[PDB]
Structures are given as C-alpha cells and as structure tokens.
Design a protein around this ligand. Sequence first.
Ligand code: CLA
Ligand code: CLA
Ligand code: CLA
Ligand code: CLA
Ligand code: CLA
Ligand code: PHO
Ligand code: BCR
Ligand code: BCR
Ligand code: STE
Ligand code: OEX
Ligand code: CL
Lengths: 341, 37, 38, 30, 82, 505, 36, 33, 32, 34, 65, 172
Amino acid sequence: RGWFDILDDWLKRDRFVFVGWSGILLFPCAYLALGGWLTGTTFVTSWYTHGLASSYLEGCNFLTVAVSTPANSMGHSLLLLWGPEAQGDFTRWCQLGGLWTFIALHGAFGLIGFMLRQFEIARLVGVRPYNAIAFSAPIAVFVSVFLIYPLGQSSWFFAPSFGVAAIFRFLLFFQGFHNWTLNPFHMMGVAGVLGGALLCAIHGATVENTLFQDGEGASTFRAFNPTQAEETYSMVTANRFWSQIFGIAFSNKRWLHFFMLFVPVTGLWMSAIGVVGLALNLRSYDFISQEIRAAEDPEFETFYTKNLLLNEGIRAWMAPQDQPHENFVFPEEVLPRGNAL
Amino acid sequence: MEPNPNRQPVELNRTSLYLGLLLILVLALLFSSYFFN
Amino acid sequence: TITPSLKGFFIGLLSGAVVLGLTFAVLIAISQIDKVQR
Amino acid sequence: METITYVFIFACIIALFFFAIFFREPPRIT
Amino acid sequence: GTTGERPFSDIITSVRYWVIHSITIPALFIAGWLFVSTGLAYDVFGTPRPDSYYAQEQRSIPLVTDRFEAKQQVETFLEQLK
Amino acid sequence: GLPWYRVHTVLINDPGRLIAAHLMHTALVAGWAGSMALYELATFDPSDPVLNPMWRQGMFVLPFMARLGVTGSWSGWSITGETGIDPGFWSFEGVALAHIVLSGLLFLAACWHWVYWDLELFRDPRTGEPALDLPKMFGIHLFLAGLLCFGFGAFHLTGLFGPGMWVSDPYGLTGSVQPVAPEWGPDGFNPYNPGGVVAHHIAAGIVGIIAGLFHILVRPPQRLYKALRMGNIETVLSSSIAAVFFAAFVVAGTMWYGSATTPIELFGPTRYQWDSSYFQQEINRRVQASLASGATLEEAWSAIPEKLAFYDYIGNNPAKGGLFRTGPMNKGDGIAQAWKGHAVFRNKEGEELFVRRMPAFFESFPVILTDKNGVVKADIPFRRAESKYSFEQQGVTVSFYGGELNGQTFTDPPTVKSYARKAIFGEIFEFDTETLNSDGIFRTSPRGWFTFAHAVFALLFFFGHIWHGARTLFRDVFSGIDPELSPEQVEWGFYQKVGDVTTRR
Amino acid sequence: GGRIPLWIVATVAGMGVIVIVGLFFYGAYAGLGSSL
Amino acid sequence: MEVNQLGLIATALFVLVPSVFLIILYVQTESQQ
Amino acid sequence: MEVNQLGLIATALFVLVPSVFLIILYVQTESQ
Amino acid sequence: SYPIFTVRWVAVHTLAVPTIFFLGAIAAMQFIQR
Amino acid sequence: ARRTWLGDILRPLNSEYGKVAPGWGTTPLMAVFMGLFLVFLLIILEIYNSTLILDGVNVSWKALG
Amino acid sequence: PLGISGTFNFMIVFQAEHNILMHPFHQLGVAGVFGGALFCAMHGSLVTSSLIRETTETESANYGYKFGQEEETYNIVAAHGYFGRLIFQYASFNNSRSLHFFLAAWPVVGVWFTALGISTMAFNLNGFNFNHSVIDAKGNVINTWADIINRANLGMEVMHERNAHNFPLDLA
Ligand code: CLA
Ligand code: CLA
Ligand code: CLA
Ligand code: CLA
Ligand code: CLA
Ligand SMILES: C=Cc1c(C)c2cc3nc(c4c5[nH]c(cc6nc(cc1[nH]2)C(C)=C6CC)c(C)c5C(=O)[C@@H]4C(=O)OC)[C@@H](CCC(=O)OC/C=C(\C)CCC[C@H](C)CCC[C@H](C)CCCC(C)C)[C@@H]3C
Ligand SMILES: CC1=C(/C=C/C(C)=C/C=C/C(C)=C/C=C/C=C(C)/C=C/C=C(C)/C=C/C2=C(C)CCCC2(C)C)C(C)(C)CCC1
Ligand SMILES: CC1=C(/C=C/C(C)=C/C=C/C(C)=C/C=C/C=C(C)/C=C/C=C(C)/C=C/C2=C(C)CCCC2(C)C)C(C)(C)CCC1
Ligand SMILES: CCCCCCCCCCCCCCCCCC(=O)O
Ligand code: OEX
Ligand SMILES: [Cl-]
C-alpha cells in the first residue's frame, strides 16, 4: 500500500483516455512531435538549411510546407537546443534545423511509448499482444528511413523532411540516385502493402456478401449483436464461392486473420532492410551482364537501360538545387538531354 | 536411465507445404536475376 | 576545465531532471488524493 | 542457362497451381 | 458503457458551455491573428520577411556552411541586409 | 504435432539437451571461423600491403586476427610485409587449426550432453523437477565475463602478457601490433584513442567482477522476480536479445564512422574520409611543405608515398558499392599496380584547373574543370553544338608529377579527356583488370559489408526481442484468451482500475 | 443540459469551417504564394 | 550474356534445400495418419 | 585449374537428389 | 453530478487551444502581400 | 536422475531456484546505478557526436599522433 | 509495358508528364493502399489477439477453429475493449458488419480514385503546379519543395525517349 502502488492505481484507472505507465513516455513525446510539426510548418523557414521556403507564413500551402532537415554541415548533430550549435538561442535553433531532430527524436520515443501502451493495455484487458507485435513494422520503417539511412549518409540533411511535397522529393531522389524500384526488398514491400490492401478489401467484401439474414431490414448492419455467439456470415458459403471462382479459398478463420497480420507486417520489414542497405549506398542499381552487353553493342536496349537514362537526368537536373551545399555548377552544355527537349 | 520425456512429433500439413513451396519458388524467381546479375 | 558545451550538458541535464521530477511530483500528488475505493 | 532457369522456376509454379487446386486437402464441415 | 465523464453532446448543447467558449474561441483566434499581424511571429522564429530573403543585389543563398560557427554565420548574413 | 516453427521448444524444460544444442551451435561457429580463415589464407596474396592490402581482396576474418596480434603465416610472410618471420604456433594457420580442433571437441561434448540429458544437477532438490536458478547463474557467468574482460585488458592489450593490438598513425601508413598503455583520463572515451580501449576493459572488468559477486550472493527482490518472470528462461532470451542487438548497432556504427578498433589498414577507409577530403588535405599539406623548402613540382609529388595517394581514391570509398556486386574490390576496378602520378590540368592561358570530384552519391558524374576560385573553365560537353568550355576550345593539357607518368605532359584532347575522367575518382592508378577479369564497377570493402550485415541483423534481432518478451509477459494467454473472460472486465466503467477486479463500483 | 439543439450546433460549426477553408483557398490566389 | 557463373548453383540450392526440407516434413506427417 | 564449370552443379545435384530421396523415405518410416 | 476538470478536459484543451490560435495566425497570413 | 562427481560438486550452485529477497529489496540501489549509467552513456554518446566538446579530447583520427 | 522494369519506366515518365504525385487522386490512392495495409494488419492482429483458448502450447492455435462451426472463434468484446482503450471507446467498432464494410470500402474507394487519377491525367488534367508560386518582395523566385520536384521532373522529361522528339514541346 506504498506510493508506487497508489500511482499504479491512478495511472491504470478506466477513463475516457487511458494513461498507464506508458503514458508518461508516450503523451509528452507524441504531443511534442506533433506540436513541432504543426509549429514548423506554420512559422519556420528552410532558407538557411535548404534555400527553401516551407511554412504557411512564407506563402506555402499544405502540400509544400515542411519541417526540413538541418544543413548538411551539421553532420549528425543531435542539435539539442542547449548544444554548441544553437547555444540556447531558440530562434537560431529554428533556423539551423533544430526542429527536425526535435520531431524525429521525440517521434521515436513516442513510437516506443505507443507500443508499450499496446503492451500495457493488452495485459490489463487480458488479450494476446499481437497488435503490439504488428506495430513493430511501422517502427522498423520509421527508424530505418528517418534514422539509420541518414546516419549512413553524410548528415541528417539527406533524411526525409517532414512534409508532403518534401516526401515526394525523397521518392524521386531514391529513384534517380539509388534505383530503389529495382531493389527486391522494396519489391517485397510493394507486394506486402498492395497484398495487404487486397486482403483488406476482399475480406471485407466477402464478409458483407455472405451475411446471414438475421433481421428483416434492408440495412443489414442492425442485425448484429456483439455478444452473440454465432458467426454473422457463412464461412462455408464464402469458401465455396472462392474455391469455384479462384481455385482455392481460406477454410480456417484463424489462419485467415493471422495471414492478414502476416502479409503487410512482413512487407514493411522487408522494405526497412533494403533501406538499411541504401544507408551505405549498397544499392541494387545495375545488372552487370546488361551493362557489358550494352557497352559493346549499341543496338541492345531494354527497359532497364531506358530507366538509367531517366535516373541520370534526374541526378543532373535536380542535384544543384537539391544539394546546395555542394555548389554544383553544371553549364548548359553538360546537362544530359535527348533531342529537342 | 529413462528415455527423454520432452520429445514431440512435428507436423506440416499439405496446405502448409503448398504455401511454403510457393514462397520458395516465388523468392527464387525474384532473386535469381540478381544472382546471375 | 568546464567548456561551454559541458556547461550546456549540465543545463540540459538539470532541465531534464526538473521536467521529470516535476512530472512525477504532480502524478504522485494526484494519485494520493483520488484513490480507488476497494 | 539463366533463361532455362527462369523458365524452369515459372513452370514449377504453374505445376504447383495445378496441385494446390485439384489436390488440395478438401475442406470438411464441422 | 461510460467512465463517468460528462458526455460531449451534453456539454456542447449547454448554455454555460457556449457562454464561456463564445469568448475563449474568438479571443484565441484574435490572439493568433495578432501574433502574425504584429510581425512578432517573424521575429520569434527567424522567418524571413518578403523583403529579407536576399540583399538588393544578391542572388546567393545565405547557406549555413559551418557547424559550430553556424549561429555566427546566420548573424553575419542578417547584417548584410541591414 | 508441433508446428515447424516450434520444434526447438522441446528444449525449454531440458537443461542438458539445451546445453547440448548450445554446444553444437558453438561448435558450428568455431568451425566456421576456422574454415573461413583457411579459405582466406588459400586466396590471399601477401605480396603488396601497399596497393593490394587485405581489404581490397575481400578478406573478412584476416583483419580480425591481425587486429589482436596475429600477423604472420607459417609460410614466412607477414601482413606488414616483413619477410622471413617466425610467428610461432599462433600464425594465421595455427589460429584456424585451433578453431577446427575446438569445434571437434565441442561436437563430442554435445553428443555426451544430448545422451546423458538427465543429470541430477538439473533437478530442483526439493521438488525433483528440472530447474535452473537463473539469478545465481547470471552472477556466476557475469563474474567469469568480468575476469576475462579484465584479463583481456590487463594482459593481452597492454602487452604485459600478450601481443597488444593494431595501432596506426592518423593516415594509416605505419600500422603494426603494439602494446597499448591505458588512457585513464577523459580522452579514454575518445573513440579514436586506443588507450581508452585498454582502460575500458580493466575498469569494466573490475565492475563485472564486483557485480558478479553481488549477483551470486544477493537474491533478486520479490517485486522484480515476479515483474520479470525470473523463473522463466525465456525472459533471459528476451533481455539477452536486447543486449545483443544493442551491441550489434554499436559495432555497425563504429565500423562505419571509424574508431581505434576499426583501423583503415585492416578494413579500408571510411566514406567520411572521402567526404572531407581527409587524405587529399594531408597530401596537399605535404606537397606545400616540400615546395616551401625549395623542392620542384616533380620532387614534391614524387615524395608522396603511393600508399597515401591510394587512400585518396574513390574506388576505395566503401560507399561506392552495390548490393549484388559480389567479391573483392579487385574484381571491379582491378588489382592496383602503380600510382600514375598527380594529374595537373591547365588551360591555354596556363591557368591551373581542378577536376570537380565525384561525390559518393553519384553512380556517374560529369567532368567539370574549375579554377582555384571555383569558376568553371572547361568541361566535357554533352550537347556539342552550343558548347563554350570544351577541352578543344580551352586547350586543356594534363601534366603528371610523381608516380609512373612523372614529367610527362599530354596535349592531344582525347587523351587529356581520358585522364580528366579518371581524376573525378581522385588520384589515378594503373590497374590490372586481366588477372581477375575485372568488370570495371566499384565494389564495397569489408568495412561496408560488415556494417550492412550487422545493422540488418540488429534490426531483425529487435523483433526477436519483442517476440520473446511478449511471450514471457503473456505466457498465460499464448494459446488463447480465457474462454470465461466475462464482458464486465473489458467494458468501460465496471472497474475503477482497468482489469483489477477488486475495484468494482 | 440540452438547450441548444444539436443540429443547430452542427450547422453553425459547419459553416464556420467552410468560411475558414474558403479563406485559405482565396489566399492561394492572393498575396503570398499566388505566383503573382 | 556474361552472367555470374555461380548464379546457377546459388539458385538451385536456394530452391532445393528449403523445398526438400518441407517435403520431408510433409511426407512424415502423412505416414503418422 | 581450368576445370569444367558445370562440374560443381553436377556433383552437387548428384549427391543431393538421391540423398534427399533416401532421407524422405527414412523419416516417414520412423514416424509410423 | 459530473466533474468539470478531468484528464479528458486536459487532453481536449491541450489540442483545441493552440489549434484555434494557429487558425487565427494562418487566417491573418492570407492578407500578407509581398 | 544421474549423479556424477562433477554434478555433486556444482550442486550447491543450482539449489536456490525460486528464492527471492522480500518486497523491493535492493531495487532503489539498482535504480541509482541505472541512472548513473544513463548519464554515463549520454556523455559517451555526446562526445562521439561532438555535442559534448572537452578540452584535450580531439574526436578525430588525428588522436593517433 | 507488360514487364517489371517496363512498369517503372511507365511510372517515371508519367511523373514527368503529369506530376502525378501532386495529384490528389493519386494521394487518395496512396491513402487507400496504405490505409488498407494498416487496417489489414490491425484487423488481423485484433482478431488473432482475442482468439479463445482452444488448444495447448504444443499445437497451432489454428486448430482451435473447425471449418463450418457455428460459434465465433474470437471474442469481439475483448478486442473492442482493448482497441477502445488504445485510442478511445467511440473510435472502435463493436458491430462486426460495420467493421468489415469499412474494411471493404476504404481501399476500394481509394483505388477507385487513383484509377480515376490515371484516367483523367489521360486527358492531361495534371497534378498541382506550384512552380515559382512563391516570390519575394523584389520578385526573386523563392524555391519550395515543389520546385525541387520540378527539377527532378525536368530530368525525366528531357531524357525520356531521347531520340523521338524533333520539336520543343512534348504535347503527348
Ligand atoms: C518523457 C518525456 C520526454 C522525453 C523522453 C524527452 C526526450 C528528449 N527531449 Mg524533450 N521535452 C519534454 C519531454 C521529453 N523529452 C517536455 C515535457 C518538454 C517541455 C518542457 C520538452 C522539451 C524539450 C526541448 C526544448 C528539447 C528536448 C530535447 C529532447 C532530447 C534530449 C533530452 C536530453 O538530453 O535530456 C538530458 C537530460 C536527461 C536525460 C535527464 C536525466 C536525469 C537523470 C535521471 C539524473 C540526473 C540528476 C540531476 C541532474 C541532479 C541535479 C543536480 C543539480 C542540483 C545541480 C530527447 C530526445 C531536445 C531535442 O529534441 O533536441 C533536438 C530539446 O532541445 N525536449
Ligand atoms: C505501387 C507503388 C508503391 C507501393 C505500394 C510502395 C510501397 C512502399 N514504399 Mg515505395 N516507392 C514507389 C512505389 C511504391 N512503394 C516508387 C515508385 C518509388 C520511387 C523510387 C518509391 C520510393 C519509396 C521510398 C523512397 C521509400 C518507399 C517506402 C515504401 C514503404 C512505405 C511503408 C509505409 O507505409 O511507410 C509509412 C511510414 C511509416 C509506416 C512509419 C511510421 C509512421 C508513424 C506511425 C506515423 C504516426 C502518425 C501520427 C499519428 C501523426 C499523424 C498526424 C499527421 C498526419 C497530421 C512501402 C513498402 C519507404 C520504405 O521502404 O521504408 C522502409 C521509403 O523510404 N518507397
Ligand atoms: C580460447 C578461446 C578463444 C580464443 C582465444 C579465440 C581467439 C580468436 N577468435 Mg575465436 N572463438 C572461440 C574461442 C576463442 N577464439 C569460440 C568458442 C568460438 C565459438 C563461439 C569462436 C568463434 C569465433 C568467430 C566466429 C570468429 C573468431 C575470431 C577470433 C579472433 C578474433 C577474436 C575477436 O575479435 O573477438 C571479438 C570479441 C568479442 C565479440 C567480444 C565482445 C563481448 C561482448 C561485448 C560482451 C557482451 C556482454 C558481457 C557479457 C557483459 C560483461 C559485463 C562487463 C561489466 C564485464 C581471435 C584469433 C574471429 C576470427 O578471425 O576468426 C578467424 C571470428 O570471426 N572466433
Ligand atoms: C556477417 C557475415 C559476413 C560478412 C560481412 C562477410 C563479408 C564478405 N565475404 Mg564472407 N562468408 C560468410 C559471412 C560473411 N562474409 C559466411 C557465413 C560464409 C559461408 C557461406 C562466407 C563465405 C564467403 C566466401 C566463400 C566468400 C566471401 C566473401 C566475402 C566478401 C564479399 C561478400 C559479397 O560479395 O557479398 C555478396 C552478398 C550478397 C549478394 C547478399 C545476399 C543477400 C541475401 C541473398 C538476401 C536473402 C533474402 C531472403 C532470402 C529473403 C527472405 C525474407 C522473408 C521473405 C522471409 C566480404 C568481405 C568473398 C571474398 O571476397 O572472399 C575473399 C568470397 O569469395 N564469404
Ligand atoms: C539467441 C537467439 C534466439 C534464440 C535462441 C531463439 C529461440 C527460439 N525462437 Mg526466436 N527469434 C530470434 C532469436 C532467437 N530465437 C530472432 C532474432 C527472431 C526474429 C527473426 C526470432 C523470432 C521468433 C519467432 C517469430 C518465433 C521464435 C520461436 C523460437 C523458439 C522455436 C524456434 C524454432 O524451433 O525454430 C525452428 C526453425 C526452423 C526449423 C527453421 C528456421 C530457418 C530460418 C527461416 C532461416 C535459416 C537461418 C539460418 C540457417 C541460420 C541463422 C543464421 C544467422 C542467424 C546466424 C525458440 C525458443 C518460435 C516460438 O516462439 O515458439 C513458441 C516462434 O514462433 N522466434
Ligand atoms: C503513411 C502511412 C501510415 C500512417 C500515417 C500510419 C499511422 C498510424 N498507424 C497507427 C497504428 C498502426 N499501424 C499499423 C500498421 C501499419 N501502418 C502503416 C502505415 C501508416 N500508419 C502500414 C503500411 C501498416 C501495415 C503494416 C498497425 C498494426 C497499427 C496500430 O496498432 C496503430 C493504430 O492504433 O492504428 C489505428 C497509429 C499509431 C498512432 C500513434 O503512434 O500515435 C502516437 C503518435 C506519435 C507517437 C507521434 C509520431 C510522430 C511521427 C513518428 C513523426 C512526426 C510526424 C509528423 C507529426 C507529421 C508529418 C507529416 C508529413 C510527413 C507529411 C497511426 C494512426
Ligand atoms: C515546438 C516546440 C514546443 C511545443 C509546441 C507545441 C506543443 C505546439 C502545439 C501546436 C499545436 C497543437 C498546433 C495546432 C494547430 C492546428 C491546426 C493548424 C489545425 C488545422 C486544421 C484544419 C485546417 C482542418 C480543417 C479541415 C479540413 C481542411 C478538411 C476536412 C475538415 C477539417 C475541418 C478537418 C515547445 C513549447 C515545447 C518548445 C520547443 C518547441
Ligand atoms: C570431430 C573431431 C574433429 C574434427 C572436426 C572437424 C573437421 C570440424 C569441422 C567443422 C567445420 C568445418 C565447420 C564449418 C561450419 C560452417 C558453417 C556453420 C557455415 C555456416 C553457413 C551459414 C550460416 C551461411 C548462411 C548464409 C548464406 C548461405 C548466404 C548468405 C547469408 C548467410 C550468411 C546468412 C577433430 C579432428 C578436431 C578431433 C576429434 C573430433
Ligand atoms: C527525459 C526527459 C528529458 C526532458 C528534457 C526537456 C528539456 C527542457 C528544455 C530546456 C531548454 C533550455 C535550453 C536553453 C538554455 C541553454 C543556454 C546555454 O547553452 O548556455
Ligand atoms: O511516347 Mn511514350 O512518352 Ca507520352 O509524351 Mn510524348 O509521348 Mn512519348 O514522349 Mn513524353
Ligand atoms: Cl516531336
């Protein structure tokens, strides 16, 4: 009946928003990550780190605002407010990119908080912790992309910036520099995300179209009771439908729902792995055998060589403005260009 | 000395065989191009 | 000798302690008042 | 050799499809 | 069903509620408005005003290029506008 | 029956066969180390530590034996290039042999422990049930770990009773195995100070001895035993995995950034050394110093050791590789033979021009020549028709100082362009591409390959921590939730405190 | 308690959003960020 | 095309070893029943 | 030594395929 | 007998208060001219 | 179970399974060392990071001479 | 193209010619597919989390369900009571029919929109163009992340089908 147990009592009270011990970590950090993003996108520029406007105050819209990465010259500095770079000056902190580390790091501890919360509530309520397990995939993606990837590179500057259009630029950077679409770890991720959405749609559609008539209304939603024992749709008819339509069907409700966990979670883990490789520029960029042939044989052409020409265009036309700290100066005559364009 | 009490049978049903072979064949199909390179 | 960044370190370190201690003081206070009835 | 390999794997996948469909464990009720 | 907090639909259809919040909500709106209209938002955060991205005859970005002198570099650029 | 993913759970309540499986694993790992070493010895060329060091040859365990003091072959060669040495029994070959003999010995003990699984040592004396006292085992093993960590630092690393470790100068020219005195001051946390490594193992070795002794004699608090399920061996697997992926992230990071324990003569340069022109600055520093004391251009550059120039080359940058570009760096750009010399470009007005160096991000990069102020003065144009800066128009020449081409000048435009294309990679070397049938495409070094593996294994092991931790804390519902969990325990308001039935309203 | 009917609260809040977001789209064509 | 000669055996073992593992387990499941 | 490149796969499969056949036959013998 | 100040009350206002303020700042911005 | 000479000798070391110190025991002391170890790792991390700069601690390869 | 790299070629050129990423119907497509994967994992994990103990730890839990049994195999109230507490109660479904309809409708509608995106970029109604939308008091252009996107788009544009254009505008 000591203080630790009294606090435990209070943190775990059943209230509108459950708190828990995990709440101590989660709620400050989530709110601060989210406040940092909203604050930066409304008020803070990227002029000195990127040579970019990036807030509503400067004239940007919701698609173009961003909290942008620190300047390349910061290396991987934690950029603490009190550190040697900002030296406690809040304004300079904002201008050097300190809000990016702020959001990234509070965001990471919030994501931990959130998964501990899924563990905490699962234990109190008495259920198996698979929702927590599944959330490991979002965490793997976040840390590999926002933390591991820029740590292998020269600086945080090459991490994603927290913005809609900024993330689009990150997509295109990865195409032109890393040829990431060619990476089989991205391809497994594509399959898991697209396979997940498929499974989501096809499982919902099936349940809704093998419903049992359990009421008399044309709205079939009313005819369900959450404490009823009986299944609300026919697994037998669903199995026959799909067997006859597609050749094979699920027959085991448990396998079905495990597979729905398995497919998208695994795909996200796979894509995280390939990004770890790209942290080191360990790309699936080329096929050697294709290049040897093409170098010797100028009539040889595939969609593979066509895409590298596109990559080479991306790199040369975007690098000067996207990597301003490098002072790239490409005279017009060196820019790769096809005929006329 | 008694025989070991902790031994257990292992199983792989036919659906798990089909699923695993498909997984392996598709992985091979995807990665083989990178092994030949 | 205590360089400017070792100074900020302690500044950062004291602030964390403050924020953390303040937080737990409040939480322990409220938990003491609004107990569960058993 | 690489062509033969690619086609060989694809052919095995098509054969697997045939057995997965026509030689599945039959779902039996209750 | 419930955990004993007062329901939202009961709160926001209540007269006391709207008596407080018809003051608190506009006041906050006007506060944020003044935060911008006074120019204070610019100065707190360091965001360039439309006239202070470049000096009159400059077209170089004032890019931070040093880690530990970065604060001093930004201050140097800002003087080159005054 | 058991699913396939659960076959090894038959060991959870069987300590002897658990020891048997751990012995087999240890045998397999010792066996790998010996096999890997023998393969590397059979493929390693020791004849040129300057331009064909181990890390260009795809050597992976050789640098780890060298790091701790193993530097010589029974064949008479050493990795430092000294000839006619007598390493004693602890040559590369004898290190490999010992691991193979250890593996054999572990295999046999594994068989004995598998058969004689039912040892009374493993039974609890009161209940007669298999039982391991994990809290005391931890103290024992920790005390052992601390003795070994202390001894490793106190005897092996100092050279008190051992060889020391690989140390080098800041530019990786003069490395060797040396005894290292402990650094007890604050610089002992400098990752680039080797004395800190010595001090770490002595200090932490004593702390582990002291902590081990505490954990042998002091029982765990009841609160923590229950919280952490300390009667359950899977809680140990959960925490152990966490410590291991923590450890794997650290060694990936120090491999990539570099530290005193990842020297560049065993693993190759880091990408940051290319990023910051680390070696180029030192070379320029030296040439200027030679020029100040009246040396000619030819003499200043000829004094540049080829080993330093080879570091100043992007083909040795570990961030230039690819995932499926396999094998040693030599398979790509070739086996380096000679420094060609420092290329100096000048235009028709005699101004010195500077090739813009390729950055590691770019698979390909255009050829742009700048003046000392960064103004573009020549390039290789893509579109020819409106070019202003062609080599042909600007009369760009290249002259070599030092190296193989010292004192030679080239003025024919296509030859000058050919060297400018190589100059974006840094310093220019002659390569043997025939011997290995090199395909000309950059591969990563063992610094790259190690970082990739350990970063990936660390991330994967995080999921294993989550999985086994979940299984420990939720063991009671692993097979499903209670079929008699009533709806009042999950519906809102019934209990003041969530899940606590003593707080009903 | 339930004085102000809920449909009326919904309608006024609703228009209040349309107005603010309207203003935000108007500002895409005026002033900062309008290309002009 | 000039492809990595070991691509073939990598691919064959990659297919054969894990498939053989599953077949072994399937057949001995059927012989229990 | 300029040996046959297909010698490796031929040897590898020569061992593997019949060895696997026997192992399959033996395991399903023990489990009945 | 309902309470007025709750953990819920705090979570709500912790978000609603800055939101309205931010909406005011952003509405002013639509009248900035270059 | 089988008794062996070596088993008899090691027996006392695997004989207190389940034994706990009451209540919270040394938990408060454990918490103190956890806290010190965190600050200690912080310092180490921030030195590597060059967020904590110390006199005479040149976090560079050039700290080999 | 009916090929893997051909697909990527199609999607890089589509971005250069239509700025599909700045198009809201492709953004709804991403939200349809991301959300679908999210809710697939959520739903799979919540049902799996609330399976009723029917088996021992030596058998797959999947054998706790027999094809064609009448009783549900999980406890939706325990799953609702977990997820309602992870967020808050009224953000969680306890009607299984509403729930699965939501699962059906979210990705289907997202993918409708992204298909309509391609179908309407077929008639050259392209993604938002904020190229040079921010300029300063003098009139200098102030780049944003959209102008950086545009540099990438340009490099795809100028390089694609490099021998096929004789005139300065790629009008189709
Ligand atoms: C649990 C909540 C939580 C967590 C995990 C974090 C975590 C973090 N914050 Mg955030 N922060 C929080 C709440 C939190 N914050 C809150 C509530 C606020 C509002 C006040 C902020 C405001 C804030 C700002 C403004 C900044 C951070 C920053 C940081 C980072 C650096 C933290 C650090 O170095 O602390 C160091 C301190 C500790 C780790 C405390 C350890 C103390 C131990 C227990 C013992 C020490 C004893 C003590 C010193 C004795 C006093 C002696 C005295 C008498 C002399 C880190 C990612 C920085 C950042 O993101 O940089 C990019 C940053 O600039 N935070
Ligand atoms: C068919 C098209 C397709 C598909 C389906 C995918 C699918 C994927 N891509 Mg790929 N991509 C494609 C085309 C495609 N891609 C193309 C053509 C390119 C160009 C080369 C790329 C380039 C690309 C890059 C550059 C990257 C991906 C990544 C990914 C993965 C993203 C995972 C995810 O949801 O992250 C979403 C993010 C998370 C899951 C992290 C955690 C999110 C937390 C929980 C947020 C919490 C929100 C919080 C509540 C605040 C909200 C409020 C706020 C919104 C207001 C996934 C496998 C990423 C990847 O591989 O990562 C490993 C990545 O970095 N893609
Ligand atoms: C008599 C024992 C012995 C000795 C002297 C050696 C010696 C060697 N081995 Mg071999 N090895 C051995 C046994 C031994 N080995 C066994 C039993 C195995 C099977 C597991 C191996 C498996 C093995 C592999 C796989 C490899 C070697 C390699 C090597 C070489 C490099 C060693 C090295 O870098 O360690 C690295 C040191 C560490 C990893 C130690 C870190 C320990 C962590 C940080 C501590 C973890 C937490 C700790 C418990 C907490 C302590 C608390 C603290 C307060 C005290 C060296 C010649 C390498 C080589 O070149 O092979 C040819 C190599 O690649 N060994
Ligand atoms: C930590 C492990 C490690 C590391 C870092 C190295 C590092 C290295 N090795 Mg060594 N090696 C190792 C382990 C390791 N080795 C082991 C365990 C063996 C025994 C098999 C060997 C045997 C060996 C030989 C025989 C040779 C090397 C060589 C080399 C060098 C080049 C490697 C290369 O081309 O990679 C290529 C790497 C890849 C192409 C990556 C493969 C990625 C896999 C296929 C992805 C799998 C994905 C998976 C299937 C998806 C499933 C997930 C989900 C769907 C369920 C390099 C220094 C070479 C050298 O230069 O030596 C002188 C050489 O000839 N190694
Ligand atoms: C010290 C490390 C360690 C140890 C001892 C264990 C031990 C265990 N795990 Mg855990 N686990 C770990 C790490 C570890 N795991 C990690 C890193 C992960 C994340 C990938 C997991 C994820 C995991 C899951 C998800 C599950 C387990 C399960 C189990 C149990 C049954 C495993 C089994 O029978 O596999 C039998 C496996 C096979 C017959 C074939 C596996 C072959 C894989 C696919 C590839 C081959 C690996 C290669 C040959 C060698 C490894 C290379 C490299 C690691 C050195 C067992 C107690 C199971 C469990 O909880 O049972 C209750 C379970 O369901 N583990
Ligand atoms: C863009 C894609 C994407 C988003 C936005 C997203 C979002 C979310 N997923 C969650 C959950 C999940 N995600 C899951 C599977 C997946 N999630 C996926 C993809 C995503 N998931 C995918 C593809 C899968 C399939 C594997 C599962 C299984 C779960 C859950 O259980 C959980 C849930 O409850 O869903 C209902 C929620 C976790 C809430 C939380 O942590 O609050 C706390 C908020 C914190 C800690 C703040 C984090 C701040 C981040 C990391 C950095 C700052 C971000 C800025 C504020 C905004 C930047 C925006 C610009 C970039 C444009 C949240 C709604
Ligand atoms: C950073 C920082 C911090 C923090 C801060 C914070 C925390 C903040 C917050 C802030 C906030 C928290 C914000 C908010 C905002 C909001 C907003 C801005 C909103 C908006 C919205 C909208 C606009 C919407 C609308 C709509 C639409 C459009 C459509 C649909 C419908 C709707 C209605 C939804 C501190 C202090 C620590 C210090 C350091 C730094
Ligand atoms: C008995 C005996 C003996 C003998 C011994 C021997 C002879 C040994 C051997 C051993 C060995 C010789 C071992 C080895 C092993 C190896 C291994 C163990 C390997 C492993 C592998 C793996 C694991 C891999 C994997 C992978 C792949 C394949 C791909 C990529 C990725 C990865 C890496 C994952 C003696 C005489 C001493 C004495 C008496 C007793
Ligand atoms: C684990 C919880 C950590 C909480 C940390 C929150 C940090 C609180 C913010 C304190 C900011 C003060 C820094 C500004 C003063 C620095 C002046 C200087 O560098 O000399
Ligand atoms: O084809 Mn296919 O791609 Ca539609 O634009 Mn015009 O054309 Mn061609 O160029 Mn850009
Ligand atoms: Cl045309």
